[PDB]
Structure 1
Amino acid sequence: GGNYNYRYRLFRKSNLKPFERDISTEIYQAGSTPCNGVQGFNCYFPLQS
């Protein structure tokens, strides 16, 4: 059926430092509209399976 329980980050405001950990799960606003925690246009979840 496929393993869909492994994910990875796909979006961030900036890069990451060496040996740095990011665990925050916030909606990524890639446009000019307040997402307000709404998954939609220019509002993409930062994790992909």
Structure 2
Amino acid sequence: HSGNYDYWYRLFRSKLKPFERDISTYFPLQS
């Protein structure tokens, strides 16, 4: 009911290579 904010996603970068993880934090990560 409140809204789950623990699940984020990356909105800004240039592109992600295949099978690459971007653990790197406007604010690119939006919940």
- Segments of 4+ moved more than 6 angstroms: none
- Match of residue 46, structure 1, among 4, 28, 31: 28
State the identity as a percent: 87
TM-score by length of 2: 0.75
Equivalent runs, 1:19-38 vs 2, <5 Å: 19-25=19-25
Unaligned runs of at least 5 residues, structure 1: 26-43
SS of structure 2 residue aligned to 1:18: coil
Q: Which has the larger radius of gyration?
A: 1
Cα RMSD, aligned residues only: 0.8
**1 or 2 for the larger relative contact order (CA 8 Å, sep ≥6)?**
2
